[PDB]
Amino acid sequence: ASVHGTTYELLRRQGIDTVFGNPGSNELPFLKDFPEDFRYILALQEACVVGIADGYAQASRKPAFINLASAAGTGNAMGALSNAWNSHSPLIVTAGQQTRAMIGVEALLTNVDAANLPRPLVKWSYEPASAAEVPHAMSRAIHMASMAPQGPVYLSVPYDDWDKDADPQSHHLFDRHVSSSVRLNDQDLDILVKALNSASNPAIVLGPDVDAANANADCVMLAERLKAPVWVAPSAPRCPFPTRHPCFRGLMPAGIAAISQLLEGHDVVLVIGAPVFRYHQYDPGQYLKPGTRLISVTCDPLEAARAPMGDAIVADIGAMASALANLVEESSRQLPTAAPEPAKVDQDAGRLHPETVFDTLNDMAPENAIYLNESTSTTAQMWQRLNMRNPGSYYFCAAGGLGFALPAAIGVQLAEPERQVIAVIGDGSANYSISALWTAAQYNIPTIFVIMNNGTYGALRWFAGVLEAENVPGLDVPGIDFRALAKGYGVQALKADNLEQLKGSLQEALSAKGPVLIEVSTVS
Amino acid sequence: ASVHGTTYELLRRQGIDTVFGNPGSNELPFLKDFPEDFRYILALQEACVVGIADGYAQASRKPAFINLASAAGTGNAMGALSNAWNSHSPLIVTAGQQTRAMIGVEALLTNVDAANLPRPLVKWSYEPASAAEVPHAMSRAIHMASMAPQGPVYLSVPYDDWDKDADPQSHHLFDRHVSSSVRLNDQDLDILVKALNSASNPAIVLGPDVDAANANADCVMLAERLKAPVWVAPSAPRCPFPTRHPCFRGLMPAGIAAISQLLEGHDVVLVIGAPVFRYHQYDPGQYLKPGTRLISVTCDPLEAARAPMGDAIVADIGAMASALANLVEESSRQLPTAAPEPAKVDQDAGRLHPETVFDTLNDMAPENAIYLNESTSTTAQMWQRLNMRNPGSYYFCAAGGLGFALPAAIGVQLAEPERQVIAVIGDGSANYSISALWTAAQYNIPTIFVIMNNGTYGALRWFAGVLEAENVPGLDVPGIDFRALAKGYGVQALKADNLEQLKGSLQEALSAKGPVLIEVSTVS
Amino acid sequence: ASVHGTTYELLRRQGIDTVFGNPGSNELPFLKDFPEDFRYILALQEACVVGIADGYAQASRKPAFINLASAAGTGNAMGALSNAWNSHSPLIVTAGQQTRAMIGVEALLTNVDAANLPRPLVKWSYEPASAAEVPHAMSRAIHMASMAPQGPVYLSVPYDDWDKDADPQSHHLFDRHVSSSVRLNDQDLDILVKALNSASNPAIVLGPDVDAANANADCVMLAERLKAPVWVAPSAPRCPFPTRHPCFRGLMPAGIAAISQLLEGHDVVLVIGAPVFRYHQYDPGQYLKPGTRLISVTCDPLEAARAPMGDAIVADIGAMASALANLVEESSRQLPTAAPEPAKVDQDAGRLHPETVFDTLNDMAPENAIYLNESTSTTAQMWQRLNMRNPGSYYFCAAGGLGFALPAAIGVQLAEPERQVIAVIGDGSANYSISALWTAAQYNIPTIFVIMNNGTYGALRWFAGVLEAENVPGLDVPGIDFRALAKGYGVQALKADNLEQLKGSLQEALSAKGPVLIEVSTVS
Ligand SMILES: Cc1ncc(Cn2c(C)c(CCOP(=O)(O)OP(=O)(O)O)sc2=O)c(N)n1
Ligand SMILES: Cc1ncc(Cn2c(C)c(CCOP(=O)(O)OP(=O)(O)O)sc2=O)c(N)n1
Ligand SMILES: Cc1ncc(Cn2c(C)c(CCOP(=O)(O)OP(=O)(O)O)sc2=O)c(N)n1
């Protein structure tokens, strides 16, 4: 067998059946004779390719396979990889290299020092030393992406390798099963459970790796048993808990002092599946107040090492959440009472308040909708206003890199064809990966894109306000017609300049058979 | 408090009380006011510093702390770090940097691009962005070295940082407990146990991480229950099993074909705490024969990813070995019978056969001796001839890097003051880290060094033989007087030119109160 | 032809005829059939191999070729490479890699991520993607080491490559001539010359790249024409000027304030072949005083970029020094008068003052002796007391990394068989690369080693004094018998406990036919 045949068999045997890509000449020998059981999803720029694959992997809870055009294609995707690193997304990023005979002279399209190119944003990065090594290297890439803590990996392959003879002993790669589904030993787990049972006022903080593990329901059971309030760790890339469950307390502010104040009076704080903590703003103070002990369960040694406080356990989040949920006692304390409904913001017949948009989405969207957020100035109100009952219902750029939500919403919608995906994206953010719209049109992936148009980089204006920073250039983005951009890429386009029109536009979008973009005129 | 005071308190609170070092000017501000409860162990060159620390960490089963002289000191230690990487040794390697005000001009002793210097031989490498970050970075270094899979880490600190004010919130670092003591979830563990119980002819292969975890006794119980032969994985850095236990079958040859042949007819092969596999010689063939299934338990995702065959489970070796030993059924098969005694090689009254040396050591050494091996041409016979009943009884350079055993034997002896350490080191290997002898003399660490002197790089001569390689230069090392070298560094020196003298020399060495070097004249 | 045959022909055609090495199994297929016109120089540890090659390259003013044992051998040499980087030494460092078929499984002796290992201490680092690329990669290594600014490079070669068929088109590599012998364009050079001619009180500062270029005599002509005092830039790795020439003013102190004070009143300061500046101690103040303009000529863009003051010209030092020396006017100012003789330090009949040792060496050594310095506390007095009339007369570890002078002195002596080499090395420094002595013995390279024995790391004691740092551990190195160490490696050994004996020992050493080590008892 050839390296090509053996590699596609390895992929198929490891559950991979879709290639997200934008092709180049070094990749044509990989893509030729493309197997009839595989699906190729084309996107027009590599930030889009990787964003789509990332949404697909996150929602499907399995690795996604990517093929990019040598160094330039890889480089165009590196902002996307920064988000993927922070969300622990299992992405197998492959790129073609020049023919081995032409690497030394650095012919056009030679990826120089290839394995160094995507660092430090990948778990593993490699170029094989021979053609027959390629299937083994691909095996390594699959498993390195998939083992806890999951993450992106990179493999560069000289284009002449594919037609060469494979090692027949590569068949041993095909059915390898590799597990990191592990949890704390019984003795030490019993110590932790007893600490939780003995707490007089426990709190729980949950991060994205809970949703990635589909540990949400187990965490609900855990919070109910412990009668504990539940927060979402700051800068949340995913939603790990039903947002109208009685224990739910919302998104933590991304500040050191703000978090220690929120946790004050809680004697044991159990953090699961989050870094401790993804702060953002400068908000100096105490990491914890006296009287609060923190215990973190994380899938990532790098998270455990860098926490500035608390104990940590490095283990699989699904295995730990299940074990804890089933081992803790039923506390006789009273169950926390549900947060009140958010207020209705006054809304006239003019431009939309973001609060109005979120309330209307919550009113009209199906109860199993999936939301994506890249409307940076409105995140707190989004979290308060969307009832998200189910797992896999929310995604936000995990490293704060704009250009994620628009393509990721297409990948999530491909992963979850029966759940309506609604991406809420600011007018600034919408441009970064605008060409991703084409893929939704071409494959008829019926994502709904809600563009929040206020003409400015709102979150930066606000931050310039808190800095008292005068004369900052580059904060306004006037003069973009998003309906025309949608038309440009073949996506149905609507515009909502007021509440009446927003409702009408959503009704049309929700019953459409294809992707729809709604440009919403929002308040400055 | 100062960064200096806070950092030493963090070290003390995390169980660190010894600094292995060779000082330079960038390190003096760290080493000043050296705490009276800490111990500084000086060595004369950095391969020696790190080799001593490495033996200490491996034998003590806890992290060792190192302080090296900027870039040059770090660089001199990089061969030592290659071994430490392969043995998963928890080494916290620190080095001083120029004062922050002088880094930009690249004053003498500026470590340029410092964090890149020890890559790829460290798990984590870093220089903090400010003085107040230093204690947090040190915390990260401690935990990154100590979490499974253990390994060396690197921290560079500008010398002006130590006198600066620490963050008072650094006190939260002091008592952090971080655990990776995890094992496979119950459901999947039950599947594995049933596969082991159902095997008709199981075999067990054990690697160094078993000895590192002190999982040896549990693996004995496991092998006894399964009535299974036990091999040591190839290129063994440690001994994971009593070498005269009835199940023991010895060191596997480091070849692909040789291993698949040895495993033929075994239906399930359980590998614990080893890469799959650390082959060395070219020996092409089948990874496994038809009919053999392999299951690997490893502490290291990188090992699981690169195995060319078999299933894998990534977990703590101590936790897994304990669980398996206690969950498997007692097989009704007959217990394997012990390997026969090795033959006595004919020995005249002249130069010593290596076999004679090992037999004599086995006869005379205490039953709790600890051996180190850097006699590269004699490893197979060493493994056959030393009865090593106890854990922690054997060390061999895990990446094949010479210059390990001589300093490591000093560190092991410091770690295990009641167990006589005996390092068996070839005349070629002895030179790499010869100056380490001084540290044994100065601190009166009573290691015994047995120099196998045959005047040549024997293993390379042999390999040149199998290659039919003629006219290879550089294979002979005549003209070294090891007794004079020992005298040079203050270590008692003896010479054994025949068996009579070997016995006499060992008797003297074994009753000595200090380190002793015996130069043994061995056959070409 | 094979890759082996083609590669040795390329080496021979590019002027390489000597391999400095310590062999391992991955290198045997390179070293087999070693050409009869090449010379292999074995050393016992890789810091020694590279130090010897470095002295050889620096003194010969041509590249030196090195072959090391995979990752461990490379790593053991990395302290040596730190010095080589700072001295711009043209070193071609090669190492063997595992066979391509065994790289993926990471068999023992696989150099993982090989090209990253020696970074950031090399100009270029690479592993070829195929066997037929090896000669081209070697060509690249040769030229990258040899082009200004010269420096070390690294090439890793899988051992199976050597026997494969070469590309016949590789013959075009053999006679390539690559030049960087360039100087500033005529127009801008005329501007510089006019600035020098117009200066009322010029000074000249010279660094190691002047001696590397053999630009010394041209700089003498330049200083004589300009009637300018001449200093050696701080932390000097080489001597660029006759030390008793009337213009010579000695070694600059390695401090910011000290240098600006020395240069005060000089209106134009021309720096040639040095960084601006290799400061060491913290000595804050002005980079230059008002009224001083600095102009730097450097072979190294990295030096020009990081200078904190002055203009710079990046060009070949030999070409620039020649052009300037021949273009400037003869100033009618008076020639500077020579520095006075240094004082004779009072010396009793006991332990030797370092000043006495240097005075006696100056009295007895030939006028074309070559000195190496690794006696860190005595450098200022060494520079004042040795009359070094000729180029290539002084070497000091360019990155401050100890372990350079002992092996480098052997390489320099091999490069300059008619010039007596005398290495003056402190008792602390002597241990780092002590095994290098063996190579001097075995090849009968008649270097003289003068060990300055005061029992302590003197320069660090002094620095601990200026820091007022109390309780610093690890500063004393008692209990080393250097005569026994020399005996151990087959080198004639003498001891000088007083002046009478020093004179007697030097007389014997100077007339000896082989290497000689003299252990000198010096004052604390
Ligand atoms: C790739 C990239 N570029 C720039 C930014 C910086 N940035 C920018 C430009 C923001 C403004 C986004 O504007 P928007 O219209 O999408 O949303 P808002 O008006 O609600 O802030 S928020 C933010 O962090 C980024 N995070 N990622
Ligand atoms: C740092 C380093 N340098 C070189 C080698 C290569 N090497 C060398 C030089 C060997 C010969 C060791 O000679 P010895 O006298 O210690 O033992 P034997 O005579 O029994 O082989 S075995 C081997 O792998 C190495 N492994 N590590
Ligand atoms: C590899 C390495 N390790 C440690 C140092 C630190 N160091 C050390 C240890 C010095 C003392 C040298 O002692 P010596 O006996 O050779 O000479 P003096 O007594 O004259 O200082 S000077 C110095 O910078 C270094 N520069 N390089």
Ligand SMILES: [Ca+2]
């Ligand atoms: Ca109102």
Ligand SMILES: [Ca+2]
């Ligand atoms: Ca509502």
Ligand SMILES: [Ca+2]
């Ligand atoms: Ca906006």
Ligand SMILES: [Ca+2]
């Ligand atoms: Ca016989």
Ligand SMILES: [Ca+2]
């Ligand atoms: Ca016996």
Ligand SMILES: [Ca+2]
């Ligand atoms: Ca030998």
Ligand SMILES: [Ca+2]
């Ligand atoms: Ca006097």
Ligand SMILES: [Ca+2]
């Ligand atoms: Ca004199």
Ligand SMILES: [Ca+2]
């Ligand atoms: Ca000294």
Ligand SMILES: [Cl-]
């Ligand atoms: Cl358990």
Ligand SMILES: [Cl-]
């Ligand atoms: Cl479980």
Ligand SMILES: [Cl-]
């Ligand atoms: Cl010109």
Ligand SMILES: [Mg+2]
């Ligand atoms: Mg990069």
Ligand SMILES: [Mg+2]
């Ligand atoms: Mg490196």
